[PDB]
């Protein structure tokens, strides 16, 4: 029965039942169907006109909430003597949604998802305290965020030609400005994203497992447009993503064990319960014990 | 030009705001929609599906052993078999259920529940049980005489291997809450107990210990509100390979 | 885009501004409304209810003793029993009344008042009183001959235990003010006095001292405006447990 | 949202500007108007008196 549900269903009054051949409270779990027993059939009920709305559990409302997807700190300074491992006034991030547990677990409640993303970038700056540096003050810098799709070259320096962005989508924003905000469409080459992928990425046997090639996004390169200054600073960029226009398919069991990696669904659990490999739920003394027993 | 003035809340980023933002890729054509089985439009459809209760959440129970309750033949009448703490908002048998998992993302809940039990003995093992729900206010009943006074179902093993006990919405307030105070008047739901209405009688060639599986689900009466962060997932450090995304 | 320019008062937080702000919890469904007795939609309904005057605001009167005026039998004619300062805006018998409490949240008031007196002697104690309201301008009358010249009611004890004296709105200006200057022409309301029209005669078995209770209320004529902070509540430090809300 | 841009003269206080500002006292009821003799509506009436 497909219908429009805006409120919880009402209750109807019921009377004494004693009829042969009818056993509403008896079910068959083996069929794979949930019990269809009604409260009106198990107890004697009254008429209740239920006015509880159900708009808060809509998948759109459930998932349309900005969540931290990226957070990166780098030093904005003179990087002449820095090693070839630090972010020299810029960084690149391979976009993914598996780095922060809250959004990952919310998204992984479904097998397939189709949505547009709303990207918000929030930048903070702090004055470096290394050595004998003082507060000085916080400069108002300009940052450039460029989206490099798959196959496009990514910048290697803070002043490389790639930043001219002839066709790549870039956003220039100040720290004193509100957080930058854009919208990315549903970029999948399929009709929906694959939250879980029971396959391998390549045509050979050495490809990655569990990552769908169709769901590849690209890179987000963030640089400071300003040239360095006599004193060093630490710039932290946070990227939040909000799904919208969502369609969800095949809900899944929630994850109980802590996440181990962003590349796979590997599990080891906690040392003791709750959420341990051998005991998800915390233990009680026996099946005849309740911990929070009201005693008076 | 138009004369204007900015209000409080101007330039601030509320993570639950609902506006339209700039399309970064103009004229982009998304992939055509194709029909996929099993679409979900409300999260109340998921909670309505029944899932196993971890009633045997005790030490010496490992893995799947925690998902079934063993019942043997007793030599005394009216004996208590087990009880289920009805605290979804706290760690217990109902915590790792579809209804429990989805409800722990919200603060307020309302509606009725159904608790189904499937008997998994042999064809010619017989018995009668009594499943009782006790509205809150007092201690958990320990005897069948006290337990029968609440809501209950007498279950007779037969061709239908499963029975249902309805935990109806009997609340004073209009909703209930997660509190972390199980004894709070706005959170406590009552108790569920199982007693022997008769004994479990099996022949010599049948196993003398049989097993029950418990499931719980929500009805159409169910409703949730005041979405929050689920306390079931955390993060103490960066996940493996997370930093490699910047290399 | 639309050309615009910001006006003075842009980005400033006026605590009395009336706008719509961002809903922090989208799609939230509030609890259904249920009928509760005693709904209040205007604060002028509360002031219209009569409450006790603290006429006996003198030392040697403790607690409830300040809420009644004792009258005995006198041996001289035309004697003054008590007077009531009509200054709501200053500390006096009218200060801790429903009308007074609600009015001290505003600066300007207008309208008529009613002052009711209930005689609480024995069934067979008799007397006659005269209650007089004197419009402002001069000193408070000290004799019955001078007091009768203003508004007044002669009250005879009987089956009806209560009498009402109306303090009508006789003002030059269109409203009145709280000033802290009781003698200001924009604030002073006049005086209320009680005299013996006859004596209080009681038999030997009745108590020779009887009691009156005074109440004051506002009429439908009443009106208040220019809301302010009530000077009846203050705070010199943090309340107990207030800081524990941060622990 | 609506795309906008600020013009010169934005945020500046011209003492002769004619706009509406925030009412600091909401729902306030002013005193009823009463007829007073000798109302003046233009300052050219005053100069016409010798």
């Amino acid at each position: 029965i497909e219908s429009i549900i805006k409120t919880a269903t009402d209750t109807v009054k019921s009377e004494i039942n004693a009829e042969l051949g009818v056993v509403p409270s008896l079910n068959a779990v083996e069929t794979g169907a949930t019990s269809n027993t009604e409260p009106e059939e198990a107890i004697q009920t009254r008429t209740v006109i239920n006015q509880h709305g159900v708009s808060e559990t809509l998948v759109e409302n459930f998932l349309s909430r900005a969540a931290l997807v990226s957070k990166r700190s780098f030093e904005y300074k003179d990087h002449t003597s820095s090693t070839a491992r630090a972010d020299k006034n810029f960084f690149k991030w391979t976009i993914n949604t598996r780095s922060f547990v809250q959004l990952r677990r919310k998204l992984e409640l479904f097998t397939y998802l189709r949505f547009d993303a709303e990207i918000t970038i929030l930048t903070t700056v702090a004055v470096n305290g290394s050595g004998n540096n003082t507060y000085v003050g916080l400069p108002d810098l300009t940052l450039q965020a460029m989206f490099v799709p798959t196959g496009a070259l990514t910048p290697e320096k803070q002043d490389s030609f790639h930043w001219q962005s002839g066709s790549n989508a870039s956003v220039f924003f100040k720290i004193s400005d509100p957080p930058a905000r854009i919208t990315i469409p549903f970029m999948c080459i399929n009709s929906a994203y694959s939250v879980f992928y029971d396959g391998f990425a390549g045509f050979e046997k050495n490809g990655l497992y569990g990552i769908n090639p169709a769901d590849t996004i690209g890179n987000l390169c963030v640089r400071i447009v300003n040239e360095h200054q006599p004193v060093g600073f630490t710039v932290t960029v946070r990227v939040y993503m909000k799904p919208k226009h969502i369609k969800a398919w095949a809900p899944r069991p929630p994850r109980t064990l802590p996440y181990m990696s962003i590349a796979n669904a590997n599990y080891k659990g906690k040392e003791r319960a709750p959420n341990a490999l051998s005991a998800i739920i915390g233990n009680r003394d026996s099946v005849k014990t309740m911990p929070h027993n009201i005693v008076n | 030009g138009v004369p204007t003035y900015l209000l409080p809340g101007s330039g601030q980023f509320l993570t639950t705001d609902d506006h339209s933002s700039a399309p970064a890729l103009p004229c982009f054509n998304p992939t055509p929609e194709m029909h996929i089985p099993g679409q979900v439009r409300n999260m109340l459809e998921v909670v309505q599906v029944e899932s196993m209760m971890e009633i045997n959440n005790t030490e010496s129970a490992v893995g799947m052993e925690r998902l079934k309750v063993d019942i043997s033949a007793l030599t005394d009448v009216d004996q208590l078999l087990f009880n289920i703490p009805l605290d979804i908002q706290l760690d217990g048998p109902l915590r790792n259920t579809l209804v429990g998992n989805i409800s722990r993302y919200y603060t307020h809940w309302s509606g009725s529940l159904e608790m189904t039990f499937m008997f998994c003995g042999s064809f010619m093992a017989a018995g009668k049980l009594i499943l009782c729900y006790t509205p809150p206010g007092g201690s958990c009943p320990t005897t069948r005489e006290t337990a029968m006074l609440g809501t209950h179902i007498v279950w007779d093993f037969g061709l239908q291997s499963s029975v249902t006990l309805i935990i109806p919405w009997i609340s004073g307030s209009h909703y209930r809450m997660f509190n972390n105070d199980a004894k709070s008047t706005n959170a406590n739901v009552g108790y569920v107990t199982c007693f022997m209405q008769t004994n479990l009688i099996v022949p010599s060639e049948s196993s003398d210990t049989c097993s029950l599986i418990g499931f719980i689900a929500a009805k159409d009466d169910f409703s949730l509100r005041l979405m929050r962060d689920s306390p079931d997932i955390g993060q103490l450090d960066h996940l493996h390979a997370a930093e490699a995304a910047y290399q | 885009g639309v050309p615009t320019y910001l006006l003075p008062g842009s980005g400033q937080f006026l605590t009395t501004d009336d706008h719509s702000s961002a809903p922090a919890l989208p799609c939230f469904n509030p609890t259904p409304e249920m009928h509760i007795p005693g709904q209040v939609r205007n604060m002028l309904e509360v002031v219209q209810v009569e409450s006790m005057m603290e006429i006996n605001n003198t030392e040697s009167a403790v607690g409830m003793e300040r809420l009644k005026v004792d009258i005995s039998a006198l041996t001289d004619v035309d004697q003054l029993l008590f007077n009531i300062p009509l200054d709501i805006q200053l500390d006096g018998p009218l200060r801790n009344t429903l009308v007074g409490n609600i009015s001290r949240y505003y600066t300007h008031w207008s309208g008529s008042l009613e002052m009711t007196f209930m005689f609480c002697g024995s069934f067979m104690a008799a007397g006659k009183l005269i209650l007089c309201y004197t419009p402002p301008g001069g000193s408070c009358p000290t004799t019955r001959e001078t007091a009768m010249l203003g508004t007044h009611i002669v009250w005879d004890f009987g089956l009806q235990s209560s009498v009402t004296l109306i303090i009508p709105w006789i003002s030059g200006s269109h409203y009145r003010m709280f000033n802290n200057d009781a003698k200001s022409t924009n604030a002073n309301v006049g005086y209320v006095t009680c005299f013996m029209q006859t004596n209080l005669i009681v038999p030997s078995e009745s108590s020779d001292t009887c009691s009156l209770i005074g109440f004051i209320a506002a009429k439908d004529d009443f009106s208040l405006r220019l809301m302010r902070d009530s000077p009846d509540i203050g705070q010199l430090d943090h309340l107990h447990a207030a800081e524990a809300a941060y622990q | 949202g609506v795309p906008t841009y600020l013009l010169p003269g934005s945020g500046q206080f011209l003492t002769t500007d004619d706009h509406s500002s925030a009412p600091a006292l909401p729902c306030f009821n002013p005193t009823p108007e009463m007829h007073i003799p000798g109302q003046v509506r233009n300052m050219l009436e005053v100069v016409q008196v010798e």
Binding site: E2, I4, E60, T183, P251 | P26, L44 | - | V2
Partner: peptide, 30 residues
């Protein structure tokens, strides 16, 4: 709400889909 953008995916969340079929998960039998 407003959506003066030329692309339809730039609009705000569409929280008005109240149709549901729970029986595809609760009674998926014949």
């Amino acid at each position: 709400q407003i959506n003066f953008y030329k692309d339809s995916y730039a609009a705000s969340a569409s929280k008005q889909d109240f149709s549901q079929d729970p029986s595809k998960f609760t009674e998926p039998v014949v």
